[PDB]
Amino acid sequence: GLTPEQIIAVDGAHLWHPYSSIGREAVSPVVAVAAHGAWLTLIRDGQPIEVLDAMSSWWTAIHGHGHPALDQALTTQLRVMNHVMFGGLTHEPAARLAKLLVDITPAGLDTVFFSDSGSVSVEVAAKMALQYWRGRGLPGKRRLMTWRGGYHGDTFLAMSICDPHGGMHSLWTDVLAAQVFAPQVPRDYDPAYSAAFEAQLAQHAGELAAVVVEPVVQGAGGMRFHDPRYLHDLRDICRRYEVLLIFDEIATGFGRTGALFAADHAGVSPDIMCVGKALTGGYLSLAATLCTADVAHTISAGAAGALMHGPTFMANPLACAVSVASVELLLGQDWRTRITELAAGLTAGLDTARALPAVTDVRVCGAIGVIECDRPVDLAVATPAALDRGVWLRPFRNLVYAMPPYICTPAEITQITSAMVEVARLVG
Amino acid sequence: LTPEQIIAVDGAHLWHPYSSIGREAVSPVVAVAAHGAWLTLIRDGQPIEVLDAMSSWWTAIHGHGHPALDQALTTQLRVMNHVMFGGLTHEPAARLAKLLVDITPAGLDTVFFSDSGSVSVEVAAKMALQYWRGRGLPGKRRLMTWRGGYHGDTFLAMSICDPHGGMHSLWTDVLAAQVFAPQVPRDYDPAYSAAFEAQLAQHAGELAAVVVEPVVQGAGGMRFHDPRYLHDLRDICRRYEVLLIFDEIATGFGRTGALFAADHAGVSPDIMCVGKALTGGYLSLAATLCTADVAHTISAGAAGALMHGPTFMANPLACAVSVASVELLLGQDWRTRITELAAGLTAGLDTARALPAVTDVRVCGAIGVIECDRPVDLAVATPAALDRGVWLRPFRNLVYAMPPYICTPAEITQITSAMVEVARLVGS
Numbered sequence: 001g002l003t004p005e006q007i008i009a010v011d012g013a014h015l016w017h018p019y020s021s022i023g024r025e026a027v028s029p030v031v032a033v034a035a036h037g038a039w040l041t042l043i044r045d046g047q048p049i050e051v052l053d054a055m056s057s058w059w060t061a062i063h064g065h066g067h068p069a070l071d072q073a074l075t076t077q078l079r080v081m082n083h084v085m086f087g088g089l090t091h092e093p094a095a096r097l098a099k100l101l102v103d104i105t106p107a108g109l110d111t112v113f114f115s116d117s118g119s120v121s122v123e124v125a126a127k128m129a130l131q132y133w134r135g136r137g138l139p140g141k142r143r144l145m146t147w148r149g150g151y152h153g154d155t156f157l158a159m160s161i162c163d164p165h166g167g168m169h170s171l172w173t174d175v176l177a178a179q180v181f182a183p184q185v186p187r188d189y190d191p192a193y194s195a196a197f198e199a200q201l202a203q204h205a206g207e208l209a210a211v212v213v214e215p216v217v218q219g220a221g222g223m224r225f226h227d228p229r230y231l232h233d234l235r236d237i238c239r240r241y242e243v244l245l246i247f248d249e250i251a252t253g254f255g256r257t258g259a260l261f262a263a264d265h266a267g268v269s270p271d272i273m274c275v276g277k278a279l280t281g282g283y284l285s286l287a288a289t290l291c292t293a294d295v296a297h298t299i300s301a302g303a304a305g306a307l308m309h310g311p312t313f314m315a316n317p318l319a320c321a322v323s324v325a326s327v328e329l330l331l332g333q334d335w336r337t338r339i340t341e342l343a344a345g346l347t348a349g350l351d352t353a354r355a356l357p358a359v360t361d362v363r364v365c366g367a368i369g370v371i372e373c374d375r376p377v378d379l380a381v382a383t384p385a386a387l388d389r390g391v392w393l394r395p396f397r398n399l400v401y402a403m404p405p406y407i408c409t410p411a412e413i414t415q416i417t418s419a420m421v422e423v424a425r426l427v428g
Numbered sequence: 429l430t431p432e433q434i435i436a437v438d439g440a441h442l443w444h445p446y447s448s449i450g451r452e453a454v455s456p457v458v459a460v461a462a463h464g465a466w467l468t469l470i471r472d473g474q475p476i477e478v479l480d481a482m483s484s485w486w487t488a489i490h491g492h493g494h495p496a497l498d499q500a501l502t503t504q505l506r507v508m509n510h511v512m513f514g515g516l517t518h519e520p521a522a523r524l525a526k527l528l529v530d531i532t533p534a535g536l537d538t539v540f541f542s543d544s545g546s547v548s549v550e551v552a553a554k555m556a557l558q559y560w561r562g563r564g565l566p567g568k569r570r571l572m573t574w575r576g577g578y579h580g581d582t583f584l585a586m587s588i589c590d591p592h593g594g595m596h597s598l599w600t601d602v603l604a605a606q607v608f609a610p611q612v613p614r615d616y617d618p619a620y621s622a623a624f625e626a627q628l629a630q631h632a633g634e635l636a637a638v639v640v641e642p643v644v645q646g647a648g649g650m651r652f653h654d655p656r657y658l659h660d661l662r663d664i665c666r667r668y669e670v671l672l673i674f675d676e677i678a679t680g681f682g683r684t685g686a687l688f689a690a691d692h693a694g695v696s697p698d699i700m701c702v703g704k705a706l707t708g709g710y711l712s713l714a715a716t717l718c719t720a721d722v723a724h725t726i727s728a729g730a731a732g733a734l735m736h737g738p739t740f741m742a743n744p745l746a747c748a749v750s751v752a753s754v755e756l757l758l759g760q761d762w763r764t765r766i767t768e769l770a771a772g773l774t775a776g777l778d779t780a781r782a783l784p785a786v787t788d789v790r791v792c793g794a795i796g797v798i799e800c801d802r803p804v805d806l807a808v809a810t811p812a813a814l815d816r817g818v819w820l821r822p823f824r825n826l827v828y829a830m831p832p833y834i835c836t837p838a839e840i841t842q843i844t845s846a847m848v849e850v851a852r853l854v855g856s
Contacts, residue, residue: 002519002526010522014529016540018514018737021727022720029517035508042516057512058739065509075502081462082492082710085484087445087821088810089469090456092429095437102441113443116712117543117738123582130602142602154736155550157583171731175557175569177602250739277739283509285543285712285740293449300448308595309581310445311544312485312704313712383515394514 004031004043027379035065038405038412040392051392054402054416059219059251060282063329064405070281073325077318086114086314093320100327101288104260106269109290113307114315118250118276119153121287122212124309125272126157129210129244132295135302141209145180145201145243151220152212152248161212166221180204185213185226194233201241210244210272211237216262216365219251223370223401225363228265235268244295250276250287254327255335256403258343258366271295281326286319330406338406342367345410346402349417356421358428360398369417371400371424382423391419400424431458431470446595454806457814462492465832465839467819478819481829481843485821486646486678487709490756491832497708500752504745513541513741520747527754528715531687533674533696536717540734541742545677545703546580548714549639551736552699553584556637556671559722562729568636572607572628572670577640578647579675588639590648607631612645616654625664637671637699638664643689643792646678650797650828652790655692662695671722677703677714681754682762683830685770685793698722708753713746757833765833769794772837773829776844783848785855796844798827798851809850818846827851 002010011029016022034041035057039050053061063070077093084091098112113128115121126144133141144161151166152158159167160177169176182197201208215231218224231247238245247270252262256278259265263273272295276287299307313319346369353371354362361372377395386393393400400423402416429437438456443449461468466477480488490497504520511518525539540555542548553571560568571588578594579585586596587604596603609624628635642658645651658674665672674697679689683705686692690700699722703714726734773796777789780798788799804822813820820827827850829843 002522007517007519007522010526011517014525014538015517015521015742016538016723016734017517018741019733019735020737021733022538022723024727024732027515029513029515032508032511032516032518035511040511040516053511055512057510058514060510060739065511066506071505071509074505078498078501079493081459082498083484083487084459084462084467084480084492085482085821087485088454088456088806089459089467089819090434090438090442090444091459092434094442095429095434098441099437110441111443111449112441115544117547117740119738120544120546120582126583134598139601154738155547155582155584156553168731168735171558171561171735173566284745285738285743296443296449300451304598305451306446306448307443308446308598310447311546311581311712312487313544314445315442316712318711379515392516394512 004046007031027383037064037066038408042392044387051387051390052412052416054391054393054404056403056405057282059256059277059403062254062278062406063281063326064407067281069329070283070322070325074283074318074322077321081317083313083316083318087310091317093317093324094315096324097320100324101290104331105273105290106261106263108269108292109273110293111291111296113289115287115289115311116313117285118274118287119155119158120311121250121274121276121289122152122158122248123155124289125246125274127309128272128289128291128295128299128307129246131299131302131304131307132244133209134304135298140207143179143204143207143209145182145204145208145211146213147182148184149218149221149224150214163221180208185230187226189227189229194230198237201237201243205241205243208243210246212246212248215247215249215252216257216265217252217368223399225365231263231266231268244271246270246272248274250274254278254330255339256366256368258339280319280323283322284319286316286323335406339366342404342406342408342413345413346417349414350420353421353424356424356428359424367403367406369402369420371420373398373400373424373427375427377423377427381426385423385426386419389415389419389422391416393419393423395423431473434458454810464491464493465835469819471814476814478814478817479839479843481818481831482821483830483832484709486683486704486830489681489705489833490708490753491834494708496756497710497749497752501710501745501749504748508744510740510743510745514737518744520744520751521742523751524747527751528717531758532700532717533688533690535696535719536700537720538718538723540716540736542714542716542738543740544712545701545714546582546585547738548677548701548703548716549579549585549675550582551716552673552701554736555699555716555718555722555726555734556673558726558729558731558734559671560636561731562725567634570606570631570634570636572609572631572635572638573640574609575611576645576648576651579639594648607635612653612657614651614653616656621657621660628664628668628670632668632670635670637673639673639675642674642676642679643684643692644679644795649824650826652792658690658693658695671698673697673699675701677701681705681757682766682833683793683795685766707746707750710749711746713743713750762833766793769831769833769835769840772840773844776841777847780848780851783851783855786851794831794833796829798847800825800827800851800854802854804854808853812850812853813846816846816849818843820846820850822850
């Protein structure tokens with residue numbers, strides 16, 4: 001065991017944090033000692049304090065932390081079978097979860113490949129698309145196309161379809177696969193944008209295995225929203241030019257944008273889909289890649305005859321079991337009303353930020369609320385300001401944003417938005 | 429779901445490792461429980477207990493449902509399932525990082541947690557590339573390895589897989605082009621090391637790192653090599669200013685008879701990956717360690733940080749069970765336990781040497797291998813071993829086992845007996 005002071009000492013000497021340095025961080029991490037419901041217990045000045053997890057621990061904790069149904073599902077599985085290899089064996093948690101995912105995802109996604117993180121699920125999606133065209137005798141179809149502003153993970157293939165600025169591709173000159181980038185997709189629908197996207201794809205169609213995009217909401221690359229009609233156009237362009245369509249719903253899945261999956265806003269189905277994050281209710285890392293029967297059969301009939309991927313902990317019973325419970329818990333309530341109330345609460349609470357000096361935009365989409373500023377937000381000013389108000393916020397670039405747990409009460413949303421508005425006040 | 433229902437869902441909707449959809453010659457066997465060294469499988473509608481001779485692909489070193497690991501998981505679950513690692517730290521991450529820095533080869537001072545072995549290999553490569561960019565030498569961006577290796581299934585990891593006999597051979601047209609030395613021999617031969625140095629010498633200005641599995645090459649062929657080669661690699665790498673990366677994802681935590689396989693040569697790499705047995709086989713987790721010099725050179729570079737950070741980085745639940753699994757290993761006389769397992773494998777596999785289809789029998793720690801003269805047919809091997817009460821998973825021409833450390837001498841003899849009978853049938 002360790003005290004918080006001992007934890008800080010070990011951490012500063014031995015632990016890498018995300019996108020961080022060793023030994024030169026301007027803000028040292030805060031010790032978290034517990035998490036229950038929508039609240040984290042953090043150590044501030046040696047005092048344990050409770051604060052709202054306004055980020056849902058990066059979109060994951062949709063039912064909040066320590067939800068009794070999900071705790072119970074994990075403990076139930078632990079007593080029967082922690083894990084077995086998925087090579088030559090199958091089990092009830094994988095079957096139950098696969099059945100659920102094929103039933104609730106956009107129509108036609110009939111097969112499920114489990115992996116251990118979002119970035120791996122993106123690599124599997126890419127491997128499916130490339131092997132598909134190898135199965136059709138067209139191995140020149142091996143590049144990916146996307147639009148700017150995206151984020152798809154940070155393994156090296158996922159990096160290649162990241163936004164070049166968000167992903168700091170200037171640091172990776174001559175390392176990354178060179179993919180095709182269309183301009184940033186706009187918020188409001190403009191058919192000229194889609195016509196330009198189609199003309200650019202048409203030029204590269206013989207080189208392209210797939211278009212890969214985040215539907216409706218671009219998360220880690222800038223918390224930007226776009227009209228769902230653009231996804232309708234992508235589905236059409238890809239159909240006509242014989243390029244696969246991949247939707248990365250790792251951040252948008254499981255109700256977060258006001259539909260079960262963001263693709264449902266446009267009423268279209270991709271050929272391949274990635275899910276993760278909220279899949280397990282935020283308990284454990286699990287991800288999945290789904291594809292159509294056509295994709296699966298074309299891969300399986302090719303000369304390779306097999307999708308050559310298979311992580312050690314593929315379809316981990318513990319992770320699948322808690323995911324089954326998390327999914328069933330979402331589907332067994334009126335989640336659509338819940339998200340509508342959350343969006344209304346975010347809109348009401350963030351409205352006064354629209355008039356602030358340094359605010360360039362305020363936008364809400366489902367249980368997502370964003371304040372865009374005209375300058376970078378200083379973490380050394382924002383974090384104490386948010387903590388003083390009992391809220392854990394993690395701004396980045398010029399954005400103050402939240403994706404609260406679905407179980408947040410109106411008062412908790414008021415508390416979250418009040419902290420967001422104050423952070424934006426202190427920016428200007 | 430009943431076992432028949434699971435089989436139906438699985439055939440319709442589940443991808444398995446390295447497999448097709450609809451064209452697998454052997455349907456998977458339903459697993460319904462796991463306890464200690466035993467799996468409960470459904471065969472012809474009836475449950476049978478069989479030994480997990482593969483440790484669920486090297487992970488279940490303490491067996492399944494060990495009370496100390498079950499309890500560590502439920503204890504952490506009652507406190508905090510998960511919190512984001514951005515701006516926060518926690519006791520499971522600090523406890524695990526402190527343990528790992530203390531037990532790994534000297535000089536490995538910092539720890540980056542990720543969710544899978546393949547990701548940890550990508551993190552290792554990113555560390556090596558950002559290191560040389562931090563030294564103003566971005567041309568040092570290629571990797572060198574020896575043939576027969578395997579390092580995971582993501583696209584960078586695939587680039588250092590064996591390019592001919594390796595499972596990723598058909599992708600070489602789209603992978604990064606790395607430098608490959610010939611297969612390292614079993615016995616020590618100074619001419620091999622001289623040739624390795626001569627080949628590295630002409631690429632040194634473009635090489636970021638040498639990446640190898642130390643002592644045992646696993647998924648690429650269960651080949652063992654003399655630890656003195658690792659001494660030579662460390663010397664070559666230091667003299668030519670190339671970083672040395674050891675992938676101990678399969679070899680770590682006592683499996684080869686030393687705590688880490690690098691310990692057989694007394695060698696410290698600059699970067700090291702661990703995984704699999706890290707969590708006792710409960711949950712997916714991996715780690716990448718590097719020296720202070722590597723961490724500080726990355727942190728002082730123009731990037732100012734290591735540009736990686738997955739959603740579930742440093743998951744409290746996975747870290748907590750890993751802490752317990754590592755402490756359980758260190759709190760017993762693991763070295764004597766592994767020596768006894770190795771002696772049991774050696775004694776029980778000896779009769780396989782006389783079988784007509786067997787070309788080699790070799791043991792290293794708790795690893796036992798029968799190498800046959802033809803590929804082993806799973807349709808024969810799987811029921812033959814199940815008939816003998818053992819779950820075995822041959823691959824290529826190999827019948828092999830990596831049993832849980834808790835196996836009794838009688839259980840090891842039951843495992844080796846089933847392996848001998850599989851080998852006997854291979855030549856029938």
